[PDB]
Amino acid sequence: DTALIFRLAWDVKKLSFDYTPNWGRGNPNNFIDTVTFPKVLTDKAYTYRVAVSGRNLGVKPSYAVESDGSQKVNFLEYNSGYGIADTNTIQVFVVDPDTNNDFIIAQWN
Amino acid sequence: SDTALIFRLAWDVKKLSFDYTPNWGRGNPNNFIDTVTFPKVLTDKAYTYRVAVSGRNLGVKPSYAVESDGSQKVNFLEYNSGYGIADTNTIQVFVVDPDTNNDFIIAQWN
């Protein structure tokens, strides 16, 4: 990670993020409805792909970043207005709009 | 890509903030380069700095401590026998990871 940080320090100079996954439970509470990141990058129109137990649910338009700098991924938009049972594995991948490559950014189970 | 690297880093560390934009400080006369400052350095280790000038290694020294604003200055006069560096020279600054003794380029003049 130290080598990665300093590669990035040379390349981009300035970087600040918080991608700590904050999982939102629904009602009933055994459902995972959302994941929220406290401080996302905003230089590109990043999108999120969701996989549930290894199955692609695909990509949906991104929620606007809030004033506090946070961004929410709502699994209800990916799953027909329902959240995901917490016994499942849930993966969120952030998509680079320049390449269409995606990178793991949140995993439940 | 940097994007790939950023999101790899983000998955590993979650939360990070730095600024290594080189801020060159000129001497007297001002065609001499005397210092470089980085606005927000990493504070997780006791990082030191290696300086090279036109291909000549001036070695590794600790810098001054991280300031209250989070910045850190490297003073070339300490490395270069008490004198700044004519700005026609190439000046390279490397951060040394004290855990591995690996070097990383972090500033280059010319």
Curated annotation (Swiss-Prot), chain B:
UniProt cross-references to Gene3D superfamilies, sorted A to Z: Fungal immunomodulatory protein Fve
Record keywords, A-Z: Acetylation
GO biological process: regulation of immune system process
InterPro entries per UniProt: FIP_sf (IPR036344), Fungal_ImmunoLectin_sf (IPR053742), Immunomodulatory_FIP-Fve_fun (IPR015339)
A GO term for molecular function: carbohydrate binding
Pfam families, per database record: Fve
Domain of life: Eukaryota
N-acetylserine: residues carrying this PTM: S1
Family of this protein: Belongs to the fungal immunomodulatory protein (FIP) family.
Protein known as: Immunomodulatory protein Ling Zhi-8
Organism whose genome encodes this protein: Ganoderma lucidum
